């Protein structure tokens, strides 16, 4: 479906920590491919997908470059944790969190649709970039002083536009080719219905899907044609730990009524949805 390249930066201050700690992950589509932790012995950006170890043989300074960027981003966020503390007039010594995600998205046909750059202080939206205007939306009211900082320097919006709509786009295309075998695969789900009798005596049917990629899936329990928003419990989609995802949808009924119900399972990987009865 869509494609994307996203980075997730998290910095936390603490009484436990002498300086605040900085962590970073990068994703192509739903697969994680790099990471960085300010608190390692020698903090360095490291591969976490097999296809990115390629990158060095036609870009030798790749890992060095990223590392420098992330060492400097480490100090950018430490400084920022202190600046924002002042904005929110808070005691020193606390536990505080500052986050940023950014990246770009393409169509299935590999054309840019959207870039983003968004930040949060203590789990609350702080500031974000409006991609169509390249101005700064101050969501937190005391983010307006950050907003005036960054708008007073056109090279900030200009550098995001160049990065979001060209640099990010070109690196994502390259990663996609580099990761052809894994990032191009679309994996249909296997699916199965299980039967469970509850201590009171009623019957739970559970429609289970696993081994699918991407993670978007529709699980529907039809009682003789009709959705059952009634007694239908879902679990949140979860990672198997090998690239794929699992989700199940349950439903409750009186013993004898099983044959009415059906589970429809649709997903990008299946020609036709799956119909499953108990």
């Amino acid at each position: 479906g869509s494609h994307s390249l996203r980075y997730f930066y998290t910095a936390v201050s603490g009484p436990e920590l002498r300086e605040p700690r900085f962590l970073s992950v990068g994703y192509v589509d739903e697969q994680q491919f790099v990471r960085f932790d300010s608190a390692s012995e020698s903090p360095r950006e490291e591969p976490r997908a097999k296809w990115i170890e390629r990158v060095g043989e036609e870009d030798p300074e790749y890992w060095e470059r990223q590392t420098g960027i992330l060492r400097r981003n480490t100090q950018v966020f430490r400084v920022g944790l202190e600046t924002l503390r002042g904005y929110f007039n808070q005691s020193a010594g606390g536990v505080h969190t500052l986050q940023t995600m950014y990246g770009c998205e393409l169509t299935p046909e590999l054309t840019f649709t959207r870039g983003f750059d968004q930040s949060a202080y203590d789990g609350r939206d702080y500031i974000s970039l409006d991609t169509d205007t390249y101005t700064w939306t101050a969501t937190a009211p005391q983010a307006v002083n950050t907003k005036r900082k960054w708008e007073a320097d056109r090279s900030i919006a200009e550098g995001w536009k160049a990065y979001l709509e060209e640099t990010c786009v070109l690196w994502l295309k390259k990663y996609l080719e580099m990761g052809k075998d894994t990032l191009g695969r679309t994996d249909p789900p296997s699916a199965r219905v299980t039967h469970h009798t509850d201590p009171n005596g009623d019957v739970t049917l559970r429609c289970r899907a696993q081994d699918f990629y991407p993670a978007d899936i529709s699980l529907m329990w039809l009682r003789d044609g009709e959705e059952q928003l009634q007694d239908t419990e879902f679990i949140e989609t979860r990672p198997a730990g090998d690239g794929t995802f699992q989700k199940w949808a349950a439903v409750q009924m009186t013993p004898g009524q099983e044959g009415k119900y059906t589970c429809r399972v649709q997903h990008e990987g299946l020609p036709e949805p799956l119909s499953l009865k108990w």
Partner: peptide, 8 residues
């Protein structure tokens, strides 16, 4: 590709 961010 990682990006160098700005002081808030």
């Amino acid at each position: 590709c990682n990006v160098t961010l700005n002081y808030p």
